Amino acid sequence: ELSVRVGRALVAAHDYAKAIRYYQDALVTDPHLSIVRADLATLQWRLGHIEEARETIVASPVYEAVGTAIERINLYLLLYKVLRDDDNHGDAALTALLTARSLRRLLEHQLRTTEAPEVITEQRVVMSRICTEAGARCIYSTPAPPPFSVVMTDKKVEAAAALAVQSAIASRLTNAREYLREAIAFDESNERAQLESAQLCYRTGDTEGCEQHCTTVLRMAEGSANTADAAILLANLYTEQNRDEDARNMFEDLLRKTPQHYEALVYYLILLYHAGQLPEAKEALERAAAAVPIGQRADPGLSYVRGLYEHLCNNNAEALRHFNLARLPAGNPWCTRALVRMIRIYLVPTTQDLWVRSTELHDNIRHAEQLLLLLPVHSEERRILQAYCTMATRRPEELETALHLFLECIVAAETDDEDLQLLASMHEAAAELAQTLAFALQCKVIHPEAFLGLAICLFISGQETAARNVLARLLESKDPIAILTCSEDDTIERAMLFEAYMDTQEGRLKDARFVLQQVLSANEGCSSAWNELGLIYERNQKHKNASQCYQKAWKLVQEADPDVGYKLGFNYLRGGQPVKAIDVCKRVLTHHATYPRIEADIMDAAYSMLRP
Template sequence: MEIQQSIGKSGELSYLRAVLAMKKQQKQEEVIQLLNEVLDNHFSSLQGLPLGIQYFEMLNPDFLLEIIREYLNFCPNQPPAAGQPVSPLLKHCTSVLETVVKTAPGLQQAVFLIAKVKYLAGDVEAARSSVQHCLEHNPSYADAHLLMAQVYLHQDNLKLCSHSLELCLSYSFEIREYPLYNLLKAQTQKRMGEIQEAIRTLQIAMGLPGMKKGGSSLKAKGRKIEVSASDRVSIFLELVDCHRMNGEQHEAAKVLQDAINEFSGTPEELRLMIANAELALTHGDVEQALSMLRNVSPEQPYFTQTKEKMAAIYLQHRKDKKLYISCYRDLVEKVPSSHTYLLLGDAYMNIQEPETAIEIYEQALKKSPKDGALASKIGKALIKTHNYTKAISYYETALKSGQQNFLRYDLAELLLKLKQYEKAEKVLQQALDHEMVNDLSALMDDSRYLVLLAKTYSKMDRSEDALVSLQRAREIQARVLKRAQLEQPDAAPAQKSLAAEISAEIARHAAVQRDYEKAIKFFKEALVYCETDNKVIMELAHLYLAQEDIDSCQHQCALLLKNDQHNEAATMMMADLMFRKQDYEQAVFHFQQLLERKPDNYTTLSRLIDILRRAGKLEEIPKFLDMAEKCSSRAKLEPGFHYCKGLYLWYTGEPNDALRHFNKARKDSDWGQNAIYNMIEICLNPDNETVGGEVFDNLDGDMGNSTEKQESVQLAVRTAEKLLKELKPQTIPGHIQLRIMENYCLMATKQKANVERALSTFTEVAAAEKDYVPALLGMATAYMILKQTPRARNQLKRISKMNWNPVDAEEFEKSLLLLADIYIQSGKYDMAGELLKRCLRHNRSCCKAYEYTGYIMEKEQAYKDAASNYELAWKYGNQTSPTVGYKLAFNYLKAKRYVDAIDVCHKVLELHPAYPKIRKDILDKSRAALRT
């Protein structure tokens, strides 16, 4: 002091006084005041000096950087949260550093410190740019690599954070001695879920010299490395958290107690208190946690974080909304700022009180009128209260002030949601009405506006305008991507994602226009920008399927499953592809995978039942139905379960039981329509006969023409007509399907006038819908009932020349069987045989195909072969058809397999005791043959 009085004010001496105050652990405010004096004295000595050698000597940049480092000890060690004010100290540091960098731009330490200050002030992108500048001039600059890692960690970019740490280590192995390096490494490991590795890394950090009590620095290669108290506490706290996450509560408590002993009486003590409260909560001691936090005063650092923690405890553990809000109210009262008002507003939003939140946000906005995030929150809160008119009015007022231009997007989005398309268009056109711009941010905004404008036009059915907007957006986005890679690398992923969205939307427009080539081109372009976009890959797969490019479709599905092996849509499509290729085993495999993960996925189960039937493995279906039943106690109440059960029973020749189960699914919004269609089909053809076929017509003697049979048919048709009235199709194909079914009901009456009416409708539909198999089959069936066989044959031959597809699989099968019936009637067994083989390629459980084949063999007196085919018809019909049983027993008799013939006769008579002729024609003869 005496020296200073004798020589006047000196910056260096003021600095020594500040250092001494820190060593004596004087109050933070006093130390900062002394540091302010240092700068005032230092810069006052430069006043009036011209820019020259003396000025550079007097400026003493190294001395100024030393002061900045001291200031940083009193700054927060993390960037501020949204809406939180930036520390005034950081603003002070920025002005000093800018002076140094302008005067000595090559001073590496100054550029690094300005990057650090920008990072701590929340200007993360500017910080990244400055660090990049440092590393370009000195790639081995360890501190810069560490700061870059912090930037990436803050942006949650763990991959680049790890990369920065690896680069840092590759340039300098001594970096392992830096506690900050180990802290960042552990934080990255923790976020990646590698808890054990994080614990090991932190334990290494704890053993470093700078971490020991009283030590705040260590030496590496003769250079002193400062370890701030904040970083040291962070290492302790990370280790506590990792032990807690690893279930090691005792270890966590031990480390925390060590930290409390180490930092007792320092400003960092409060962070440890918050962590201690967190630990008490893990043990269920809510009151202890609260009592620890209650004693913190507004003058202490971390007061805001303490109040936030208390509020969270009141809400989550005590479920007390009143005390939750009181914490934030107290915070606003004690520390009034736009940030605390924002926190209070957010708190009201959390407890679903948006009206109060809006009032609070508006008060915050008065304190910080240029805060765009706040303005946006007010708009969104108004939307949440469904106060759309006020939200629109608010956005418009904010826009008129000219300060919140980015709110145009929010306003347009709201107008689009409210279906006010013309207004949305006007807002977006105003946003785009400007001179050519070259600023990257403006280009990014324009691209977003154009995409939203395209959505608006699509809603207005202005497809051409939508496409023009998308093409403009695509051109702008191409420019954005080129520049973003260099100017804003961190923004590049989001911009690539937008580019992918634009290309995909252009592709969707092309697909609607059935321009599949163009659609495929743009979907592929979307995947160049975002190669793992599952939705786009799936859409591209559907396009290939529409073009019947099965291999390309399969390739896209394989890519999807490589990215996400549990992707349900891709697995379903892969199964579908295998189904189309008639590789039923592979199709079954894919469906089984889905059902093993979720046995009560009834959509998958219904598809699997169909495929197992086509694969000839009906006997495997019950185990999947059992799995679904065991998976959920509610299975027997689920419409989906009853639908699947009905499907199985129908396929195994139990039409009455099938009807009962379909009936339980009939009223369901998801399963009802399909269940009703199946019920109608069962009513019209319970025994799964070939409608219009003549080969088996007279086999049952007079049974087919009995009064009882005719009454039963009439009752079934009336039931089908009633069910038809319950069908409510929502799509054009659905309406066509309903028309087809209505006319099948008309045909089922077998009355000539009705059949002719049906024929007229089928002809009309077939003319409008090219190659529509259900309509062509309807025409052929009507012709057969009207005894116009040549005309029926022409329609059926037309169908037989088409490519089989899974959508019309049932109609294809019926068409081939009816054509085979016609050929058999005219003695063309070879041609019929080829058609029956085609049927069985697509459905190995097709009873009728085996029955017809057996009939042909029987006619050719190949009784063994006939028996083999009837055996399969009997097996896949679940041994329920007396007609098939009769034929099988008859051919066993002819093939001298008397015991087998007797067994089948017993099974038929057990189910149908009055079945004619089987006892006399086969059973008695087989017994007599055995006796001799």
């Protein structure tokens, strides 16, 4: 009974090979002690030795009293946890479920032994959790990924395997239906199971079970820390049904219950930005700010929410200030997201993004990379944002390095002189890793942001056709539900904006207007979309509605953009209202004084034609 204590005090000293040797020796001494089997399997799995842990599980004699079946089911679920990375993975969970259901003997024990009420119902929630995990395993995990390393050019059998996998995952989904209904039947207090069932209902492309179950989440998920996951799906469903007011009200009263729910606050904010009702979030932000006890430093969630609100109003300076205040302490759940937001702001400061055609640029990308070095090296976001920072420089060799970085990203997804020294070293590292194009064309589009980055790299470097191909491949997934999402992720919307930009260079504008109307119906605060529709109106000489939407854009921007201000002033000049043009240009200069061509093209003619 002290061999496990020796093993634990031995792994406390952080000797891991020695722990493996000692536990294997104590296992050979007595292979009927299950605790050391579990500890050895856990340790081997944690160190990346999956095969050795599986050998430890299989070699157990167990793989009838209550304890024996308890160790049986614990071994089964531990085997599943080790094999969390197909059919093979789910089999252990299924067998654990079957043995747990047989564990009949529990009923025969408890219904007559008159045990404690706590210990009678304790072995029910466990079974419900097993069922819930099986259902989530079937929903999320995909037996899809093949090697597809070039391989012989096959006529049919690859397609046969593909459709067999499709039938397999459909069977997994319909079996997960049974697993989840069993889970919710065995325990109604499992908020997680209700969430999984709602997600499954939304998943199956149904128009009836959706409103049957994944609308009832207010009754299902009453209150917990995972209510944000319910709220995002509920909001996306409501926006699909154009039931915007209900989506508002559920956020209203859920935040009335919890003023400090920063993730739900973010969803509320992005919803309002989509609806164009941005100032309506000010009272919610004030309630969150006053929800602090006596004052004190703003919590990182609160600071991130404030920075997001400022950024959505094109108040990028206060956005950067609040985002920088969000990363403290580092390693918080927002610190990665705050860093990503800061890098995005330094990358695209205005509404104009990287896909448009320089000491300020060098300083901006310098600060961007200085922040980027704060990100974990193994994180995917750092790996794609490194390519983004490199492609920001517009240097063709940096474009090549970014292109190769993005190709590496998609391939991996398919399967104070010291600071300057670090900057230079990471630049050299990107250069040497840059020293696969058909992989982008043929592989599954699983990582959308890497696809967008690759597409804009192709466009900036000059190849418009390949950018068209890769972005069409990215957006053939959803083309819509994706835009109607109330999510922080906006890569799809940015893809729509890029498609509008590319179509504006093709001589055609009807499809660009189609895309713009789609995104603006989804998102009323898309100032760049208003700008582009105003511009194509200016091509169509429809100047009144162009000025109207430009005023919309100017209101959303809060009079802090040089390009929409420039075109608004030019429209006022063509409209013969030089006072308004002078006002717009004075706002442009009091915010961005270094913008060229503003005075010499608008202010001079406004002064000249003020009193004709």
